Copies of this chain bind each other. A is one copy, B any other.
Amino acid sequence: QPWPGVIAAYRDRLPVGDDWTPVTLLEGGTPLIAATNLSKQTGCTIHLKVEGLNPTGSFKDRGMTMAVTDALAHGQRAVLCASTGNTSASAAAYAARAGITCAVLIPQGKIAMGKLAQAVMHGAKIIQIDGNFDDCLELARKMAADFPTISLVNSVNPVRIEGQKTAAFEIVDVLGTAPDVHALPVGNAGNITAYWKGYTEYHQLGLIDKLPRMLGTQAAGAAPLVLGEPVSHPETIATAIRIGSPASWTSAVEAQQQSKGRFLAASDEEILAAYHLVARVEGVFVEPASAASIAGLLKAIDDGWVARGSTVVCTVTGNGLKDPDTALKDMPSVSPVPVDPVAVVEKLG
């Protein structure tokens, strides 16, 4: 009775022919954990969609099966993207399994090799550019439009969004309905878009009656969807949402406007508080960007934007294991305590 490809599990809902060979690491089918302790504390009933348990440790895997399978079927020789993030690790894994070249474009200056390690493990070719992060985007786009054998797998890839919409399907599949509000973090806004595409596809299929309110959280230092303008120098420890200029700007706002949803900023402190909260109280280890979403849900419950007793799924987008640096910092100082059994046992209970 095991989980198959997200492609296989939802084929009749995805744009794939009968001919193609789905290349999958059995992504999706991820836990939906009852946040019993967050629920008691709020008064709302909160589930966690835990996407860190996808093959590469983030939800990008839902897009890549789809992007890479479509690439294979369409006879592409290379899969390209231009960021140091979870996109590249996810892209590189699926390209490796397909047997396809994977290139990651990066800007000049200092390289965070910690970021790229997982992807280079999978065979990604890293290519550093005489220029900045814009040049990377401009380059990757020009190549994709010049070489129909390259497939740019960035946020705005229609196939990626199709794959990613399935997280919405699973939530309903197990609950029997949508939540009252779905809360997720927003960087490029590809995900909020996908969930909204997903929920509306089920409503259109007559599988729910109520649609959720999409709550998207941005870090205060990179909150262009909150402030209504692009951000010149995005600034947040939640690296995955360190975006001053979302790729899927239009689609995010449409989702917000159509779902009667909200965009909301959380400060780094508040993100960090959530970061610790989930781990300390739910037993779930979540990446800072994933924490931001909880940080925002919580912020919204105070405000009263989300009503007491309503049902909420909070997408927690990546494994805490993605980011050891942040785990290391703000740790309690342990100093040697004497070796007798009685002293140590009182330092507890």
A residues sitting closer than 8 Å to B (CB atoms) are 1-3, 25-26, 29, 31-33, 37, 50, 53-57, 77-78, 89, 93-99, 101, 103, 105-106, 108, 111, 113-114, 117-118, 120-123, 125-131, 135, 139, 142-143, 146-147, 149-150, 170, 173-174, 276, 279-285, 319-322, 324, 327-328, 331-339, 341, 344-345, 347-349
Contact = CB atoms under 8 A, between A and B. Distances in A.
11 contacts: A2-B29, A25-B283, A25-B284, A94-B283, A96-B282, A118-B320, A122-B283, A126-B334, A127-B337, A131-B339, A142-B341
Nearest to A77: B349
B123 A280 contact: yes
Nearest to A349: B77
A161 to B, nearest CB: 22
Given A29-B3, A96-B280, A327-B117, A130 B338 contact: yes
B336 A143 contact: no
A269 B87 CA distance: 30
Given A32-B2, A57-B321, A331 B120 contact: yes
A232 to B, nearest CB: 23
B117 A336 contact: no
B111 A334 contact: yes
Contacts of A122: 279-280, 283, 285
A337 to B, nearest CB: 6
Contact of A143 (B97, B101, B111, B341): B341
Given A77-B349, A284-B55, A285-B122, A173 B1 contact: yes
Nearest to A99: B37
Task: Give the number of times this chain occurs in the complex, counting copies.
Answer: 2
A128 B334 contact: yes
Given A130-B338, A334-B111, A328 B280 contact: no
B349 A101 contact: yes
A285 B56 contact: yes
A117 B328 contact: yes
A285 B93 contact: yes
A131 B339 CA distance: 7
Given A25-B283, A118-B327, A127-B334, 6 more contacts: A2-B31, A3-B29, A53-B53, A105-B344, A125-B347, A130-B336
Contacts of A333: 111, 113
A274 B118 CA distance: 15
B143 A345 contact: yes
A173 to B, nearest CB: 7
A130 B324 contact: no
B281 A96 contact: yes
A119 B98 CA distance: 35
Contact of A128 (B31, B89, B93, B337): B337
Contact of A114 (B101, B322, B328): B328
A124 to B, nearest CB: 10
Given A53-B53, A57-B319, A125 B348 contact: yes
Contact of A150 (B77, B173, B345): B345
A97 B129 contact: no
A95 B91 CA distance: 35
Contact of A121 (B103, B135, B279, B345): B279
A64 to B, nearest CB: 10
